[PDB]
Amino acid sequence: MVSKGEELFTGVVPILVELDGDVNGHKFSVSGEGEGDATYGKLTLKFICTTGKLPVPWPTLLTTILMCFARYPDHMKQHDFFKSAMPEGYVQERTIFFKDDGNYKTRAEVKFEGDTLVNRIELKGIDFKEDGNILGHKLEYNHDSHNVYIMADKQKNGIKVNFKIRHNIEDGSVQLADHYQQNTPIGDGPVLLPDNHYLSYQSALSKDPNEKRDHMVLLEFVTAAGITLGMDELYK
Numbered sequence: 412m413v414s415k416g417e418e419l420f421t422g423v424v425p426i427l428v429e430l431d432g433d434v435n436g437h438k439f440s441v442s443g444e445g446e447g448d449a450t451y452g453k454l455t456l457k458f459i460c461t462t463g464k465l466p467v468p469w470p471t472l473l474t475t476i477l478m479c480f481a482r483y484p485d486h487m488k489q490h491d492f493f494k495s496a497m498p499e500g501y502v503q504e505r506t507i508f509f510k511d512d513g514n515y516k517t518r519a520e521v522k523f524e525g526d527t528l529v530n531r532i533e534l535k536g537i538d539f540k541e542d543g544n545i546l547g548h549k550l551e552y553n554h555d556s557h558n559v560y561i562m563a564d565k566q567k568n569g570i571k572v573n574f575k576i577r578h579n580i581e582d583g584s585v586q587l588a589d590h591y592q593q594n595t596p597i598g599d600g601p602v603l604l605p606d607n608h609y610l611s612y613q614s615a616l617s618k619d620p621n622e623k624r625d626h627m628v629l630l631e632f633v634t635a636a637g638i639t640l641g642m643d644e645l646y647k
Contacts, residue, residue: 416497417488420449420479425527426456428476434536435513435546437466443476445629447528449494452482454631459624467536468550469627470578473614474590475505475517476629477530481610483635490605490635492561492570492594498523499598501569510587513539522597544578544586551579554614558636559590563604569595570605609636 413419428443445456454477458469465472479493493501500522507515519532539546559574572592577585596602615630 417494419497423448428530430532432534435539447480449480452634454480456629459626465625470550470554473554481633487635492603492605495603496596501594501596503594505592508589512543549581556613558609558611562607567595
């Protein structure tokens with residue numbers, strides 16, 4: 412018996428992910444599994460495209476396929492909406508706009524199913540260019556660090572999250588992916604509505620040398636941080 416959602420995260424927690432996607436009419440499914448440890452801010456995951464070849468590059472789906480595993484420092488624990496919503500979970504919705512290309516729209520439920528944290532997702536991608544960086548597979552197999560900005564959404568009893576991912580293209584250029592995100596509790600009980608803050612993300616993408624299916628091995632590190640007010644030198 413636990414009083415607060417955060418109590419469910421003192422140790423290692425198994426994770427399952429299941430994603431059904433449809434990008435420019437190309438349908439696919441991805442199944443993932445691994446574990447997360449919020450005391451360390453770590454998630455380790457392996458994803459398989461169970462339907463065959465993935466029609467888009469793995470890094471484009473990375474953000475879509477569990478912010479509840481963030482390490483929030485002691486002095487910020489009152490701002491952890493994600494764990495507070497557990498075990499009932501939250502809905503996580505995004506639109507992702509790839510600059511000069513198509514967009515993904517996603518809806519996910521992240522909740523406990525028995526002892527396991529499960530992220531179930533639907534994704535629809537439309538308006539992609541056949542010879543663009545996404546359908547043309549021109550992205551590098553990496554995903555650089557990014558700080559994602561979170562503000563409370565009082566009326567929805569949830570949060571809004573905006574950030575812009577800079578995907579690396581093989582020719583040295585960047586493909587921008589503007590993310591607009593919202594999270595709302597599934598349950599009706601009180602959740603923590605956070606002051607504005609960041610989650611700092613890192614991602615490391617690899618391959619399993621014994622795996623012949625289309626797949627991605629993913630390690631994430633995520634830690635919460637506060638904000639500093641930037642000042643132009645003029646004002647210092």
